[PDB]
Chains A and B, each alone.
Chain A
Amino acid sequence: EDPETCLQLNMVYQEVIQEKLAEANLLLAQNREQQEELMRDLAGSYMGHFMKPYFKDKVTGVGPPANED
C-alpha cells in the first residue's frame, strides 16, 4: 500500500541482524583474546634468576653494590 511499511520492517530486520552481528563479533573478540593468551603462553617464561642478587643487570649480571650495613 505504501513502502513506509517496507521501511519499518526493513530497519527492524536490520536491527535484529545487527544485534546478531554484534554478538558474533563479541564472540570473535573473545576468541581472539583467547588466542592472544595462548600465544603469550607460547612466549611465556624462573625462581633461580632472583635468589641472592634479586636485582641484577641484564648486560653484566651483577647486582647492586653492598649496603653500608
Chain B
Amino acid sequence: IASACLYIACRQEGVPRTFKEICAVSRISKKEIGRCFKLILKALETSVDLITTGDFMSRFCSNLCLPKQVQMAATHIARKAVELDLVPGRSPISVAAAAIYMASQASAEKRTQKEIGDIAGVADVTIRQSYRLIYPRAPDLFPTDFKFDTPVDKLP
C-alpha cells in the first residue's frame, strides 16, 4: 500500500516514475505494486492523468551523462513520434528509451542499448522493437537546429 501511494503521489505531482523504479526501491514485485495502485485508485474514487513520454525524459537523461542539448533533442523526437503515431499502443517508456538511444547515437556522446535499458528499465529487445518503428523517420523527428558530430543521416 505504501509503494502504491508513493507511485500515485509521484504521478500526481507531475514527476511520474515507472513501476520498475518503485519495485527497485520497495521490497515487493511490480505485480503487487500495480495491483495495489489499481485498488487504491478504485477505493479513493480519484484518478491520475495519463503519463506522457516527456515526463520521463529529464530523469532518464539526467541519470545518464547526456548533455542538455541531447535531452531536448530526445524529448522533441519522442513527442513528434507519438504525435505522428509511429509507435501505436506502445508504452511511453519504450518510446523514451528509443528516442534517448537515437539522440545519443547521433550526438557526440554515444550510449548502447544496454545502459539505456538499465536506466529506463526497458529490455533491449523492447528498445529495438520501438526503435525500428521510428527508424525510417529519424531526421524529421530531430530538431531543425541540432548540432552533432556523427551524422543523423547514418545510424545503426
Contacts and interface: CB of A to CB of B under 8 A. Distances in A.
A42 interface: yes
Interface string A22-57: 000000000000010000001000000000000000
Contacts of B136: 35
Contacts, number: 3
Contacts of A42: 132, 135
A35 B132 CA distance: 14
A42 B132 CA distance: 9
A58 to B, nearest CB: 21
Size band of the interface chain A makes with B: under 10
A35 B136 CA distance: 10
Interface in B17-44: none
Nearest to A38: B136
Nearest to B132: A42
Contacts of B135: 42
Nearest to B135: A42
B156 to A, nearest CB: 12
A19 B131 CA distance: 39
B131 to A, nearest CB: 11
Interface string B42-83: 000000000000000000000000000000000000000000
Interface in B102-156: 132, 135-136
B83 to A, nearest CB: 22
A42 B131 CA distance: 12
B127 to A, nearest CB: 16
A42 B136 CA distance: 11
A35 B135 CA distance: 13
A42 B135 CA distance: 11
Contacts of A35: 136
A35 B137 CA distance: 12
A32 to B, nearest CB: 12
A42 B129 CA distance: 12
Interface of B: 132, 135-136
3 contacts: A35-B136, A42-B132, A42-B135
